[PDB]
Amino acid sequence: PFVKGFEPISLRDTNLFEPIKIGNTQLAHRAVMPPLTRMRATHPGNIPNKEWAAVYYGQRAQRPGTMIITEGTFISPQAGGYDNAPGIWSDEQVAEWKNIFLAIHDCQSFAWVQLWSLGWASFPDVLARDGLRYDCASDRVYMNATLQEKAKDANNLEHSLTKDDIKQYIKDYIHAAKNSIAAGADGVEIHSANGYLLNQFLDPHSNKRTDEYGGTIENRARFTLEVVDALIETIGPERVGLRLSPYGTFNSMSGGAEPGIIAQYSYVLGELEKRAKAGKRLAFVHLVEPRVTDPSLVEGEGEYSEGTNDFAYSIWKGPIIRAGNYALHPEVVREQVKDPRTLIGYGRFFISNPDLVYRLEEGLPLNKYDRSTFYTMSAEGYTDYPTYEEAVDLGW
Ligand SMILES: Cc1cc2nc3c(=O)[nH]c(=O)nc-3n(C[C@H](O)[C@H](O)[C@H](O)COP(=O)(O)O)c2cc1C
């Protein structure tokens, strides 16, 4: 059914429907599908779904010139721990990714692989099954006492990364980035947000290290910036974006309650702009908004009111993607896209609206999303959300 209380506004007349160059790609409009974990990949081997994923992505690529960022994709076994999320380290994984990318390119849209590493958000017992470590910035902090218990129950306690461990993650990012590009992706997005491994190094709650990877703003930023630099130099800066969530509390991050958190992110962005000034500008920065501090909460819940991402615009001068409860607030988008380098990521309503871009252009009602099929091994709730016309052919 359609979202009941929703009054659509047509955005055809705004910068949301003006083209923009992002890296090597040429977008027709600035409505971006952000990374969305859907757990349709098959076990063993974290293989993308061969029946439905190319259909799902192709449906949502239908408007030519759409930028699509894939679900989080593991760079290596050690970086994972979720059996039904995809990887891109292996030949069999890349075999299906080529077909997904072909489905998006057949629609004249673009595909960016979000490269993922889980750190303390992983499952210690699944990792142990596979002979893998339970990795974190500092083993003196756990997400919660439950994951602490399961960690001890699996005899796989948190492992503070060594310097050699970090170097191996950097190699795995390079490997996964190279596989992404050889498979046909137009670029990659380094996931450094939402409390996963790289965010765990940025945040002073998770990162209590005393080597060169913690203890200061500069040290906490080092792992993320080394991944950035490694990929700049192997696939080029125009094929690399970075995702950050300054105000997020998901996965036990500090958010705005830490008064030092804007300095931490301001340092990362300043370092990105320095690289751009020396001729190596990343394709984009992708920010999660304080509008959504936790994506497991319904729209309007978990909204942080005492901070904004405006600081980013004074530091980073390249494209910025913003994401968080924009689908139901066209009045906010209308304002924010007056800035000529701003794109809007639409998460949960891209799940439910394959023709979301058309609906935003024409101001049409939106399909409700069904939270119970966000993560089921099913085409139901994946590829069977109707387009607007189909929805009217159904009574909605
Ligand atoms: C089911 C679901 C899966 C998501 N998966 C990812 C992911 O793999 N990587 C990521 O960076 N963000 C992920 N997110 C966060 C979204 O990209 C987005 O930032 C957030 O949902 C807020 O945007 P929205 O209100 O438009 O949905 C996910 C969110 C949801 C709801």
Ligand SMILES: O=Cc1ccc(O)cc1
């Ligand atoms: O499954 C939800 C999810 C949220 C944020 C992410 O970064 C990844 C997955």
Ligand code: NA
């Ligand atoms: Na390879």
